[PDB]
A and B are shown apart, each in its own frame.
With several copies, the nearest count.
Chain A
C-alpha cells in the first residue's frame, strides 16, 4: 500500500490483528492484504468476503 494515497482512510482492526498473528506464525498471510483497507462498514467486508 502506498502511504501517500492511503494516508487518511481507516484500516480494518480484525484484518490487522489477524495479519500480525499470521505473519508471526508463517501461515499464508497474503490473502488478508486485500481486506486491510475497509469499505461500507467494518463488519460487512468480513461477512460478504
Chain B
C-alpha cells in the first residue's frame, strides 16, 4: 500500500497482539497499547517507543 503509516500499523498490530505479555511506553493514556491499530493513520499519532 502507498499509505505512509503502513510501518506503524505493522508495529501496532503486534503491540495489540501482545497485551499483558509485554508492555511498552505509549504516548498518552488515550492512544494506549490496547487501542486498535487502524486508528492512527497520521504521523502525529506514532508512538514514541
Among B23, B24, B28, B32, point to the contact of A31 (Cβ < 8 A). B28
Chain A 4-33, CB within 8 Å of chain B: the 1/0 string?
000000000000000000010111111100
Chain B interface residue number, banded:
under 10
Q: How many residues of A contact B (CB 8 A)?
A: 8
For A23, list chain B residues within 8 Å (CB): 25
Q: Is the interface of B mostly helix, strand, loop or mixed?
A: loop
For B25, list chain A residues within 8 Å (CB): 23, 26-30
Specify the chain A residue showing the minimal Cβ separation from B30.
A28
Q: Closest CB of chain A to B11's CB: distance in Å?
A: 16
For B2, list chain A residues within 8 Å (CB): none
Task: Tell me the B residues contacting A by CB distance below 8 Å.
Answer: 23-29, 32, 48
Task: Tell me the A residues contacting B by CB distance below 8 Å.
Answer: 23, 25-31
List of 5 A-B pairs having minimum Cβ-Cβ separation, nearest first = A26-B23, A26-B25, A28-B29, A28-B26, A28-B28
